[PDB]
Amino acid sequence: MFEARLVQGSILKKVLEALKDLINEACWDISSSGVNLQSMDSSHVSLVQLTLRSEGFDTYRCDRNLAMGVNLTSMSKILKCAGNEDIITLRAEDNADTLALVFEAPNQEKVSDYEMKLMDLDVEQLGIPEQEYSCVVKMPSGEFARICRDLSHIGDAVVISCAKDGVKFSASGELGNGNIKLSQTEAVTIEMNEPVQLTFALRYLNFFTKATPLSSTVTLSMSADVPLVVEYKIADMGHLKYYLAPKI
Amino acid sequence: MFEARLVQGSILKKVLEALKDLINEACWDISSSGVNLQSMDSSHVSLVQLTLRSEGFDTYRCDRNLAMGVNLTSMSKILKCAGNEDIITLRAEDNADTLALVFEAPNQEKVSDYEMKLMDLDVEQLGIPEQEYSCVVKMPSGEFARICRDLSHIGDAVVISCAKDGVKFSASGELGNGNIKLSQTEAVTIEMNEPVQLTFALRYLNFFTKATPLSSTVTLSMSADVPLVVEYKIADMGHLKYYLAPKI
Amino acid sequence: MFEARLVQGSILKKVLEALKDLINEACWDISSSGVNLQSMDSSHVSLVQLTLRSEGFDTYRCDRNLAMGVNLTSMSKILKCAGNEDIITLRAEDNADTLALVFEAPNQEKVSDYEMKLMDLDVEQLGIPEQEYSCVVKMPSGEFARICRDLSHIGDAVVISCAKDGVKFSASGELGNGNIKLSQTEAVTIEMNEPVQLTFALRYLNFFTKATPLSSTVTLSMSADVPLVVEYKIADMGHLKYYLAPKI
């Protein structure tokens, strides 16, 4: 069997919260080294990649590698029945027929379990390439989320301009324009060689920031001509990365 | 006249909150010994019974027994204009023509009063029978409400299974299934002779738990073949009971 | 140029919150002595008057008087991107072509700016007359807002009756009636010579109380036959006044 006990169960609730708007169904790939999901959003625009490593769980067993096709709407609904304090265990027989979620409240007197039916999915097989980035900005996840919420009241698209000493996000539309200038030092840190300037759909960034509760930092990785990576580290465990192509 | 002063006015606000979704109009029966309501829900599915005893009020007068036909939507709207801290008095001349609600804030400088027109209702005359229960579970009202909210994401119907040492609530539907196991000891206490297992519409239980703020305990009384009683004691005053038939 | 720095930026956010439901576009008249707006609501029912005096700003410059036609929906949206803690500056070149709002967070590491296009408006030219009031009631803005919210559940119209020692607000409708009696002393103070009794659309009062966060006091000025003035002082700076004709 597969069995992953997570004492900080809320990590899972939050991971589902951060994917349900983007993806209806995907493979969770289970292996010795942990849990891996890679999928395109349901409109084929961004690509989402999730890593939850073994070590990050309180107990972790995997006897055979599995590819469980999970309906994320369903998993999300079920994770909403877990309390924020609960210990959450994922468990599946190796035939990968159903997935169990078990929620045990800390006062060990209530225990919930849900079994969700798994699907077989034919999934578009994709490989994320080797990529160098001219530019990596690391900033509080809260700020980034507010910038994206704010500019979306102004237009559809944000232009991100990155220099050695600061980053600027701008948009414009019917009502006029806006920008927000952030300076290098919560901490803001820029590592760049080339300066970049790219443009992105605020709609997708707004979905990405559903991940905000997973981490108090977000990292933006950019380079001329290649997708932006918006990464949230799930402390001591892995990351959730979103990939989005610049507009032209 | 009829006059009931309630210093903890919020009890009334909460009682209306716990009935408005279930019942549009009903008789409040006023007598010496207190206030009594018995009515079927507006779809003829569950039966609601309310007791507010004399002693429970700070002052209580009743000179003639009354049967006031009250529109509960109306009474609810008006009770929403009372502050949570207010002293609330119900008052009616014995002709039962209108009902007054008076709300006096504790800083005795603001006083509100509303008069609502009363109706004459022809009401379906019902008698609740003598019943023994194989099984009575007493548990925190909050938990019960969360169980009902949670399982309703899974299916329509909850199967309640009761043993000497614990109770289990299960449901299933399109997305898979769920159950929650609660153990006997907030305190959970089971008094049973026969074990029972019955099934109920989560829709009605969900309405019943609108009563949750009235008490931190709820009591479930069950027996093969007869309606479940979901009871909330209104401390030092009476109870609100809901009755619901098991499905088959 | 025109430039007004406001360290307590939230005053502006709140002023827009208190006008956006009432008015789509209006002239902000800029002069040496401060900022002035006067406009009818978009249905031609009430008149709104705003004063923000020079002295009230931390820095204030005006080199030429301006009449900026501002879309208030737009200004409102943009002011929603300011944090409550931010320092807000209004700035316009004297040609009055666009208006800039600059939001600098207190940790001087983030700075936002928005430019909104200005319009030329042909506006209905009105003069508010000299008026004496029989009656002026000063009361907590919170209470007034609750009275208006509450009575609107009862009817459309509130009858305000004012005596030397107290004020009463009443309404009635389908469900029955209500009144709230407030006594002269939070503080309630009546200055009257003639007693008045007038009736007003609760719809407009409800819009007016969108101003509640600007001040913890509201002042009602009344007189037979003339509009009511609902005034909110914006401490150390000016006022927002709404004018509304009694019904007959």
Ligand SMILES: N[C@H](CO)Cc1cc(I)c(Oc2ccc(O)cc2)c(I)c1
């Ligand atoms: N045809 C595919 C989607 O339906 C296109 C696609 C493939 C890949 I691999 C993508 O992911 C990445 C990730 C990092 C990169 O540098 C480039 C593409 C994306 I966004 C879209």
Ligand SMILES: N[C@H](CO)Cc1cc(I)c(Oc2ccc(O)cc2)c(I)c1
């Ligand atoms: N930190 C300094 C004030 O103490 C001045 C300052 C402020 C900001 I915001 C900065 O950041 C940016 C970022 C992007 C821009 O386009 C302009 C300034 C810099 I560099 C210096």
Ligand SMILES: N[C@H](CO)Cc1cc(I)c(Oc2ccc(O)cc2)c(I)c1
């Ligand atoms: N025909 C009636 C409803 O329209 C049926 C009815 C009558 C009674 I009295 C009920 O109440 C109880 C209460 C306790 C019991 O043991 C049995 C019925 C119910 I639920 C439905």
Ligand SMILES: N[C@H](CO)Cc1cc(I)c(Oc2ccc(O)cc2)c(I)c1
């Ligand atoms: N309390 C013990 C752990 O310290 C073990 C335990 C846990 C639960 I939840 C229990 O309750 C139930 C209730 C219903 C069931 O169907 C199964 C266990 C029992 I009995 C013992």
Ligand SMILES: N[C@H](CO)Cc1cc(I)c(Oc2ccc(O)cc2)c(I)c1
């Ligand atoms: N025809 C105008 C509106 O479209 C009517 C109008 C004019 C004025 I000046 C008003 O304002 C006041 C303000 C104070 C007063 O004593 C009288 C009118 C109002 I309310 C409506």
Ligand SMILES: N[C@H](CO)Cc1cc(I)c(Oc2ccc(O)cc2)c(I)c1
């Ligand atoms: N303050 C006194 C109780 O300590 C009694 C009291 C209460 C109220 I409310 C009052 O106010 C009103 C206001 C309007 C009315 O129509 C009647 C009473 C007065 I004058 C005295």
